[PDB]
Write an enzyme that holds these catalytic residues in place. Sequence first.
Site, PDB file in Angstrom:
ATOM      1  N   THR A  39      45.041  47.734  44.903  1.00 14.20           N
ATOM      2  CA  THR A  39      43.876  47.741  45.774  1.00 14.20           C
ATOM      3  C   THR A  39      42.881  46.655  45.410  1.00 14.20           C
ATOM      4  O   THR A  39      42.026  46.314  46.232  1.00 14.20           O
ATOM      5  CB  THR A  39      43.189  49.099  45.713  1.00 14.20           C
ATOM      6  OG1 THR A  39      42.813  49.380  44.361  1.00 14.20           O
ATOM      7  CG2 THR A  39      44.129  50.173  46.187  1.00 14.20           C
ATOM      8  N   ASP A  54      47.469  57.059  41.275  1.00 12.45           N
ATOM      9  CA  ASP A  54      48.153  55.768  41.207  1.00 12.45           C
ATOM     10  C   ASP A  54      49.581  55.937  40.706  1.00 12.45           C
ATOM     11  O   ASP A  54      50.532  55.426  41.310  1.00 12.45           O
ATOM     12  CB  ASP A  54      47.388  54.801  40.302  1.00 12.45           C
ATOM     13  CG  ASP A  54      46.223  54.131  41.003  1.00 12.45           C
ATOM     14  OD1 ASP A  54      45.892  54.526  42.140  1.00 12.45           O
ATOM     15  OD2 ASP A  54      45.634  53.202  40.417  1.00 12.45           O
ATOM     16  N   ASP A  67      39.218  51.293  39.415  1.00  8.44           N
ATOM     17  CA  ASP A  67      40.065  51.254  40.596  1.00  8.44           C
ATOM     18  C   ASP A  67      39.376  50.427  41.670  1.00  8.44           C
ATOM     19  O   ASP A  67      38.224  50.698  42.019  1.00  8.44           O
ATOM     20  CB  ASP A  67      40.332  52.677  41.086  1.00  8.44           C
ATOM     21  CG  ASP A  67      41.548  52.778  41.983  1.00  8.44           C
ATOM     22  OD1 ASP A  67      42.671  52.886  41.453  1.00  8.44           O
ATOM     23  OD2 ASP A  67      41.381  52.773  43.219  1.00  8.44           O
TER      24      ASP A  67
HETATM   25  N1  LIG Z   1      50.367  44.503  29.902  1.00  5.15           N
HETATM   26  C1  LIG Z   1      50.177  43.690  30.964  1.00  5.15           C
HETATM   27  N2  LIG Z   1      50.141  42.356  30.809  1.00  5.15           N
HETATM   28  C2  LIG Z   1      49.957  41.529  31.848  1.00  5.15           C
HETATM   29  N3  LIG Z   1      49.792  41.933  33.109  1.00  5.15           N
HETATM   30  C3  LIG Z   1      49.812  43.245  33.408  1.00  5.15           C
HETATM   31  C4  LIG Z   1      49.999  44.222  32.332  1.00  5.15           C
HETATM   32  N4  LIG Z   1      49.967  45.433  32.910  1.00  5.15           N
HETATM   33  C5  LIG Z   1      49.770  45.243  34.237  1.00  5.15           C
HETATM   34  N5  LIG Z   1      49.663  43.939  34.527  1.00  5.15           N
HETATM   35  C6  LIG Z   1      49.441  43.352  35.864  1.00  5.15           C
HETATM   36  O1  LIG Z   1      48.157  43.741  36.334  1.00  5.15           O
HETATM   37  C7  LIG Z   1      48.207  43.881  37.749  1.00  5.15           C
HETATM   38  C8  LIG Z   1      47.690  45.257  38.118  1.00  5.15           C
HETATM   39  O2  LIG Z   1      46.272  45.259  38.032  1.00  5.15           O
HETATM   40  P1  LIG Z   1      45.450  46.630  38.096  1.00  5.15           P
HETATM   41  O3  LIG Z   1      44.276  46.546  37.162  1.00  5.15           O
HETATM   42  O4  LIG Z   1      46.398  47.795  38.002  1.00  5.15           O
HETATM   43  O5  LIG Z   1      44.922  46.457  39.601  1.00  5.15           O
HETATM   44  P2  LIG Z   1      45.779  46.800  40.917  1.00  5.15           P
HETATM   45  O6  LIG Z   1      45.087  47.981  41.527  1.00  5.15           O
HETATM   46  O7  LIG Z   1      45.703  45.536  41.725  1.00  5.15           O
HETATM   47  O8  LIG Z   1      47.171  47.125  40.456  1.00  5.15           O
HETATM   48  C9  LIG Z   1      49.641  43.620  38.171  1.00  5.15           C
HETATM   49  O9  LIG Z   1      49.802  42.270  38.609  1.00  5.15           O
HETATM   50  C10 LIG Z   1      50.414  43.854  36.903  1.00  5.15           C
HETATM   51  O10 LIG Z   1      51.585  43.045  36.920  1.00  5.15           O
HETATM   52 MG   LIG Z   2      47.981  49.537  39.385  1.00  6.15          MG
END
Ligand SMILES: Nc1ncnc2c1ncn2[C@@H]1O[C@H](COP(=O)(O)OP(=O)(O)O)[C@@H](O)[C@H]1O
Ligand SMILES: [Mg+2]
Lengths: 317, 538, 526, 525, 55
Positions: free
Chosen positions: C93, C391, C60
């Site tokens: 975040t 989340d 996170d």
């Molecule tokens: N299976 C997937 N393939 C590609 N992109 C993804 C997938 N799952 C989530 N995302 C993208 O990853 C990002 C979320 O990143 P994450 O690790 O959750 O950090 P954050 O806290 O910024 O959400 C978003 O832009 C989402 O669209």
């Molecule tokens: Mg997320």
Amino acid sequence: AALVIDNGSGMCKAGFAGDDAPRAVFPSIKDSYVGDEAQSKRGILTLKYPIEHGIVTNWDDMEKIWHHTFYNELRVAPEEHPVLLTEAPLNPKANREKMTQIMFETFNTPAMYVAIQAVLSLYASGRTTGIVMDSGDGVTHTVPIYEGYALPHAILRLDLAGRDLTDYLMKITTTAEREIVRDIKEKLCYVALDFEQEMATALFQPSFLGMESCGIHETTFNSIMKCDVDIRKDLYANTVLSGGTTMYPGIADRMQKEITALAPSTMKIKIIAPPERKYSVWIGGSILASLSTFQQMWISKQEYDESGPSIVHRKCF
Amino acid sequence: ALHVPKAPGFAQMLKEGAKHFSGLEEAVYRNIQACKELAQTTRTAYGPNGMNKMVINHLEKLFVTNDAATILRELEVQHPAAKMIVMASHMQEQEVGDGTNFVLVFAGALLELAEELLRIGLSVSEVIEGYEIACRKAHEILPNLVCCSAKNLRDIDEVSSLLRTSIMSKQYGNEVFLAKLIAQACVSIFPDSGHFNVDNIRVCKILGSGISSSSVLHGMVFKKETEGDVTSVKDAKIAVYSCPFDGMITETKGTVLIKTAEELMNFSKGEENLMDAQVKAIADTGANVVVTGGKVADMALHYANKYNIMLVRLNSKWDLRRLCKTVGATALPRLTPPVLEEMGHCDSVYLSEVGDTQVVVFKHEKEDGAISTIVLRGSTDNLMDDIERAVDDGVNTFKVLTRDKRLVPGGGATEIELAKQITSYGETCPGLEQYAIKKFAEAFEAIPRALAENSGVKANEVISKLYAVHQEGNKNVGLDIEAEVPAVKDMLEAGILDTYLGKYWAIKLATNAAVTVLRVDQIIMAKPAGGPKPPSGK
Amino acid sequence: GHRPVLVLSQNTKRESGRKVQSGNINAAKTIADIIRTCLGPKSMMKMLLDPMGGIVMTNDGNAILREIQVQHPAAKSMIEISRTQDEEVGDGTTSVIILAGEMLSVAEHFLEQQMHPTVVISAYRKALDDMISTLKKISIPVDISDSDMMLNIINSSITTKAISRWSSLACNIALDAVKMVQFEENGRKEIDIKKYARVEKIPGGIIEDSCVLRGVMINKDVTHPRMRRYIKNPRIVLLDSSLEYKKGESQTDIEITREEDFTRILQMEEEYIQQLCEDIIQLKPDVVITEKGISDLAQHYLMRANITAIRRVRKTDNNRIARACGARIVSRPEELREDDVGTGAGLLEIKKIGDEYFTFITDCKDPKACTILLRGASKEILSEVERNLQDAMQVCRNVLLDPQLVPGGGASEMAVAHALTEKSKAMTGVEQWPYRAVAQALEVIPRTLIQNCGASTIRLLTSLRAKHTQENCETWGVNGETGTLVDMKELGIWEPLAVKLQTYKTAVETAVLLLRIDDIVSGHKK
Amino acid sequence: AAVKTLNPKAEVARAQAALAVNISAARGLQDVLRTNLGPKGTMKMLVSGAGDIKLTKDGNVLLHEMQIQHPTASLIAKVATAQDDITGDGTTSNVLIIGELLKQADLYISEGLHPRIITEGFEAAKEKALQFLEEVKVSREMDRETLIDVARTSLRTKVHAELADVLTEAVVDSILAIKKQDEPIDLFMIEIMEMKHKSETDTSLIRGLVLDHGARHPDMKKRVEDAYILTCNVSLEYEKTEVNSGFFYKSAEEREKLVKAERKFIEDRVKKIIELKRKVCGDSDKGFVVINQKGIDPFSLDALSKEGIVALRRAKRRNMERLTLACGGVALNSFDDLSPDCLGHAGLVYEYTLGEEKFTFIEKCNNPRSVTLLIKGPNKHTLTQIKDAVRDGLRAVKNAIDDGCVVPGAGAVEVAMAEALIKHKPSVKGRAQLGVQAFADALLIIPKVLAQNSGFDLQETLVKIQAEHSESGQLVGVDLNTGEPMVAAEVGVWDNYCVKKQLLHSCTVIATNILLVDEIMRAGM
Amino acid sequence: GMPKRIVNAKIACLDFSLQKTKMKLGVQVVITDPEKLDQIRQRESDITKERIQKI
Ligand SMILES: Nc1ncnc2c1ncn2[C@@H]1O[C@H](COP(=O)(O)OP(=O)(O)O)[C@@H](O)[C@H]1O
Ligand SMILES: [Mg+2]
Ligand SMILES: Nc1ncnc2c1ncn2[C@@H]1O[C@H](COP(=O)(O)OP(=O)(O)O)[C@@H](O)[C@H]1O
Ligand SMILES: Nc1ncnc2c1ncn2[C@@H]1O[C@H](COP(=O)(O)OP(=O)(O)O)[C@@H](O)[C@H]1O
Ligand SMILES: [Mg+2]
Ligand SMILES: [Mg+2]
């Protein structure tokens, strides 16, 4: 870590083990932002301090204080950190059972321990054996300590604290003017080796004030004489003084002289009273909570659940 | 290439001041060496020829004794395996009262021989198997070695002859006198019921007149003075109170609320009149002696003097309880006059001066009572403490005889016979256990070996003689202390006997201690604490 | 002697100029690089060591940046904006940190080229407004009554987290929890998942048996073992007052002169406790729950009525029990009414989990509060599961409030960047360059996704930037698990419009903040 | 690096180095705990900073007592602590399987394979292993013989063989007494009292209760034959008023009257007890024992002794329930309306003095739903060791009863699950098959170490055992006396299904989370 | 438990605290008939209740 809440009939002086200074001196310790980050504290700011003369009067108050010295001025959770609370010497068993019920039942603390304020004061000075003369605002106490524990049988309790001290000075009435006398008490009030040679150029003796029980030096001497004759050397030679009351006159040598007089002409008495860290009890508690013998002494939550007020009283009735 | 680094893993993750020992070399042999050092520290005190030691503890207090458990307590044993052997020895002291030095000697010997066997190629598991099976054989054997039994513990000559052995190892020069004293004391106690309590034997140490001035007293002695003017009483009618000898006061808080000059004028006179009434009711029950566990008031003392009552003040509560048992009284929590059952009686209660010390004596004339005292005279406090330890040994022997009246021959006779029989058992057992059985047997030889070494003779000559005579069939033969040369004699006909229970428990505990020490393979010492000691032990 | 005659205090250090600008931007992009690899579904865990001997194993962004300490004020500001994103939307975040870092990085260019920071800032504000327009243009609505659609929305939010292995399970939990916490009173809708959705982590067991309760759970046992531990239709009473006899607030000093007065006073205390307990029994409850103590005499009187009591509960737990069983906390049993009694709980149980006694008030009907009982291997694993569930629940809440969706996998970033580049061609002033640079700075999200997937940034970004020049391709993005371009309508990664709007706003405004900054000063005391 | 430019006093382990750190720590733990496994394991001695001695073979105790300051070791210690809190057994095996999963994963990650693929293989293998476990589990009616074999399998690992044969009967009898048909077993109803006077094989099961205190009035009886037990929670000592009453008198006579009156409140409760005693036993045939959770002042002790009542004070809050379930009375917080139905019965009550402390035995109850294990031993460390062993054994029997299934032991289930995983591997898509292989070689650490501890060759024994299991299919494990395969279900070597499932789940989870760690970071200053 | 939205808001601004009534410094409660103590304690709260009811 281990939260070390030093009540010490002062303020909360709470924090963590390892810190050289507390982080939560609540009594007499942002705005225009959004949330309840001032109102919740504004409530406590005008709440009366429960401990009077070193004894808890209102427990709901104390509990509310602790709760606000955990969630607001520490922003932590007691459900995972052991707590070291402090109690005045010769504190009633009932108060112990109450605070242990509060911590284990309300705050759900995994383990806790209640230490005597004089023992922690001695710890902060680095020693583990000696007789501590604690004179604060409401009470005077002599605590003989051997192997780091306050011998529960030689605790002599007399009453000549800041109040009783400034009394005769007032005699020599209105709040403001008796507080002028107390301002002089707060300022220099050099102890007199001999009042004869001290008044010539112008507690030790009950008759002076008007009491009829004993001096503080007599008290120390008899508390040392109600202990082991072998540890007598250590008690006589490791007398540690504490308390703003006793600090204000800076009494070391008058005591030393008349205690030497009382004692046999063998043990050499040395009194260490220059620290004034203004957090001695807190630092002693931190040292204890840092040690592993504190884990040894833990009254655990399971122990509490299985025994109750008996575990708080450590059995041995 | 000038430093060997700590190996990855536990060697690196270990804390700074912590130690880790593992394997036969770093752990087992080091533990055996420590226990051997312990056994050597206490070996020279074993037996009547055992010499005293002058141990000074951390508080600069002096202990002059050849009592193994005392020396161990006052030594600061810091090696954990030695700590375990000492724990076993203290369990022996607690269970039996005598035999701690046997436990040490035997455990140290078993561990030395176990080290030998591990060097020849046996495994700790097999050594433990052999040691345990041999301990079982020793316990199977010992009942058959019992020669005598007490047959009467109400006598004083038989009981003296029985306690002589236990009080000979300690205080060898004077063992008939002390055995007589302890027999007198023990038989005054020990009622028609089979229960005997050792805390009912009190020992008062007064200084200045040699040990032969010691005496037994059917009663109690308190190094106190009398509070009042009366000092002697010949038909004591003692009344015992756990409360002070003062007017009862409130548990909450008391305030004398005066509102009229008359109440003020009458309060003090009313107080004294109340006190006079209370003490006069007590005196009118016939009581001539009052013993209070609390303080005495000046007015109450005044009126006790007026009505010719001897006042005694016992600060301790145990002293009060023991006085109640002595006199047949009941401690009353109120200052109410006692009923005919709550009162105690003594043929005499008087204040005397034994030496420099002033004492209050509650003395019965009958040769019985619930508590008896031994007044020890002596020119040195350390000497008197050693004689008190000898008294404790004799009293614990008397209790062991109340529990189990069986006796085995001493002076190493039982040990030699055990060694012989267990060797004969190991010679029959095939497999790798026979080595350990024979070493367990030979370990018994350490006892007559220590006795011989301390008497000042060749232990090998003594042990060879004992083996030869025990082969001829004599199981009651042991070594003779009264011989400048190696010699042996009939322990039974000489009257040198030990307690079946003493040997039983000593063997059991020593074997368990050795086997426990052997079962250790890894040691993980922590950095030494500066902690204010264990919380529970205070 | 001649003591220093200074104007400012010694220790007051003042930096100024392009050094301060470059320093702030480098600190920001360093904070970004710290968590750059923690973005997407193929991220890796980080094990942070607290000053209290604790451990935090997480993915996170806000957890990581909150656990590290810095001294540079720019890094402080970046950690603060991560905190802001976490408190507002509870996701994104680390996307926000990366976007802010990239915006500052591209502004460094224009600053080295003699452009004034205010020009860059005006361009950034234009670009932010146009991002908002484009996001609101490409968004689509959602039927929040479709539980499967909502489970997909929540999966698109937890797929990037450790609980992905029990993703479906966790999804249901979050959805259930939020659907119960939705509350309306006097025309005010409230999804308060911080006071009324509680996560209790009991180490041991298996995560697959963790569940959301139709009720609440506390760590408590009966005050007296004669009390029942299982009640199938409990009428529940909640109290803020002590069932003990406490002193009065005034100096209530007594004065005794008669004999019977002490005994009469102690019996008066007993009678007071009796009267309290009778005032309670008159409502005929089965369970009594107090925030304060309960005297043993009160326990006797309640047990006589066959009532089970739990002594010292927290005010927060008391409020959740209120919402769950339908009760109303009172502080004077004399003021107790049937409307204040708690009907709605279907079962009260007190069962032994491990060596502890836990009180369940479960089987409730229409409980406006819940307890998520998490079970797992260790406190660390369960703390991470709790953050991931936070989340998920925060995403569900943002959805139920604003049901608009935008495409994930970086599809939204590329669509908006393309729209900004297309609008930039009408711009004739000097701000077109920073504006187009912000458009090229939005591309970092798919770049990071591709990097963390282990694919070729150049090739994939080229194909994707080209795909987004066609007409109906604003939904095309990339997989964080295989490194290929896909249609989000076909993959299913859809984030809440509110989340990405707040993300972009926080990023652009942080960039504006750090660009306006110059002339650092230091030293002066508080 | 990145973090060290912002917080210069920051410690950081990145990607491969981070993996290197974590796996190294795991292997270090394994090297320590490898010897704990099985009855042929060795007991370690652990000396505190104060000098206190612990003799232990228990994985959780060993962890918390080793002197370690490693973050990975902290993670694994917490996983083991949860294992112990919920199941009571499985901690050493937990640590071993964790370490071996990490090692077998390093085998393939050193070859440039990404940890993600190994973790996918871990998840597949977890699923298949849980399936095979539920299939091979033995659903058995938990008879005294089955429970005895279970408790033997635990106590023989934790203590010596003869003492294990004693604690077996003690523990099984203890649970089979406090057990209610289809109602979860409350182990709180088994008090555990330790006495430090006799041999360790004297540890017994008292079908009653043993309080660690006795009567404080000497005139009170030390033995009571047919006893009425009054379990109360009522103060019988002086209680001062809450409102600070204070006494005011004008005369010594009034002072005396107030002193006599101030105790009337407690004299009345003593009188209630005494009247109940007289009404229920009008003669001296029966006995009457008051057991108070609260205090009893000397005056009340005198008043009750005079009437022939044995009063113990300040008992434990759990002894209230244990006494009402053993004896069979009602625990009271007030004597307002007390009746003979509030009393329990004990066919014997007596006192035992041990040095300076006193114990009170309450035995010959009718059908006590609460009992006690009296842990006798000559040493504090013997008592601690036996306490740990009986905790393990109680948890084992409780789990075998709760989970009516029971799994074969001696690594048999591990061997068979390894074979099943190796037969399942092809059904896995991609290179996660390698993670499956690692899982299998990780499962195989239990028999290997058993061989290692019995003094046999790991490779030879394991091939023998796997060969025997492939030719027959009989779930076989290690015979620690011959090194040959043996049928664990036939020789009475039983393990807990709950323990094995918890191992699989928790070990897989923590190993996955560690393998996916790519940065360890201390930057909080 | 209080509502968090009110429409036709009638607002009462008070510059005093609404707490259990405590007698001031120069006032002491001294009981000499225990039968009065209960009623005194009751007023300590009922006084405040009455004020709130009036509002
Ligand atoms: N299976 C997937 N393939 C590609 N992109 C993804 C997938 N799952 C989530 N995302 C993208 O990853 C990002 C979320 O990143 P994450 O690790 O959750 O950090 P954050 O806290 O910024 O959400 C978003 O832009 C989402 O669209
Ligand atoms: Mg997320
Ligand atoms: N007169 C004697 N002749 C030979 N041996 C004796 C004599 N008196 C005592 N012993 C022996 O001394 C040993 C006990 O001496 P002691 O130092 O007290 O050891 P412990 O403390 O084990 O009793 C026993 O073996 C006993 O048989
Ligand atoms: N008599 C035996 N023969 C062979 N294997 C055994 C025997 N008793 C126990 N085991 C096995 O030894 C392993 C470790 O035992 P134990 O140390 O009690 O477990 P843990 O390692 O969890 O503490 C278990 O898997 C058990 O199946
Ligand atoms: Mg002897
Ligand atoms: Mg086990």
